[PDB]
């Protein structure tokens, strides 16, 4: 569409950041969520290893992703890790997620990165077929382990 | 072996050990036509406050190690830690070394008040798959890894 706009957040974009987090809360159906203080979120937004992309309709965030820079020891060309990606259920399928991926990969290409990667749950068929629609270089079935700390 | 082994988190002046671990990675992962980055680059990476390396030592020889990245969260003030690579010397595999590395790493991030540490293994790597399972993770999950090689 011509009205939709993809933008990368900056220092004074905390309100848009919070709006995206609220979208994440909604789409991911997170329970009993308590958003961190704005002081914390502001400092994170200011990190040079963290970049947020959103899809906007006028003032309304209808989609977004978060990404982390991982400097490599194999190469002087860093990696980018897309951690979260969501599209508002009322705008799911508008080309939004593709536009976000394209913007993100172009951004890291300009910065001389080697590779961008992202994970989707095996049971999440909507995301699974979405990422395949973005034509990634490759996909690999893997297993994710995590240790909840005391 | 346990009373010979040393598990440690690398310090600022441990670039030689870092390079040794990278070389171990090159061999264990069977990386082809690898060219190690300049030492200035590796030193700066080692010194990053969001990157920590844990190694296993016998005298001066690295026999195993892992690399970890701190990921500050927007869901919580408690960060995440991402274990990116883990390898053990093929002649020393499955003698508790990998378990000790995971234990040390998780203890470090637990003390720092992190929410969780996570790590991934290939579906076909049953060596790795049931190693991590032997470490008693809180949960495991089937996922698909997508990547985009940039021009
Ligand atoms: Cl809240
Ligand atoms: Cl930039």
Fold and architecture overview:
Chain B: CoA 2 binds at residues 88, 94, 96, 98-99, 130, 134. Chain B: Ca(2+) 8 binds at residue 151. Chain B: Keywords: Calcium, Metal-binding. Chain B: Mg(2+) 1 binds at residues 8, 14. Chain B: Mg(2+) 2 binds at residues 12, 47, 49. The PDB classes it as transferase. The structure is a homodimer. With 150 residues, chain A is α+β, with helices and mostly antiparallel strands. Chain A has a single domain (1-150), classed as Gcn5-related N-acetyltransferase (GNAT) (Aminopeptidase, 3-Layer(aba) Sandwich). Chain A contains four helices and six strands; from the N terminus they run βααβββαβαβ. In chain A, strands 1-2-3-4-5 form a five-stranded mixed β-sheet, sandwiched between helices. Chain A is globular. The interface between A and B is large, with 58 and 57 residues. β6 of chain A pairs antiparallel with β6 of chain B. The site of one chloride ion (CL) has 3 residues of chain A, from loops.
What hetero molecules are in the model?
Answer: chloride ion
Q: Helix content range of the residues of chain A, please? A: 25-40%
CATH architecture of chain A: 3-Layer(aba) Sandwich
Q: What overall form of chain A do the CA principal axes indicate?
A: globular
């Amino acid at each position: 569409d011509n009205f939709l706009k993809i933008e990368r957040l900056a220092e004074n974009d905390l309100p848009k950041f919070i709006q995206l987090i609220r979208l994440f809360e909604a789409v991911f159906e997170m329970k009993n969520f308590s958003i961190p203080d704005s002081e914390h979120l502001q400092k994170l937004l200011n990190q040079n290893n963290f970049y947020v992309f959103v899809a906007l309709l006028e003032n309304k965030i209808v989609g977004g992703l978060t990404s982390y820079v991982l400097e490599q020891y194999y190469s002087e060309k860093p990696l980018a890790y897309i951690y979260d990606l969501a599209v508002d259920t009322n705008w799911q399928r508008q080309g939004i997620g593709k536009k976000l991926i394209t913007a993100t990969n172009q951004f890291y290409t300009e910065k001389g990165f080697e590779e961008v990667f992202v994970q989707a749950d095996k049971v999440d068929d909507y995301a699974l077929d979405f990422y395949r629609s973005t034509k990634p270089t490759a996909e690999e079935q893997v297993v994710h382990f995590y240790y909840t700390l005391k």
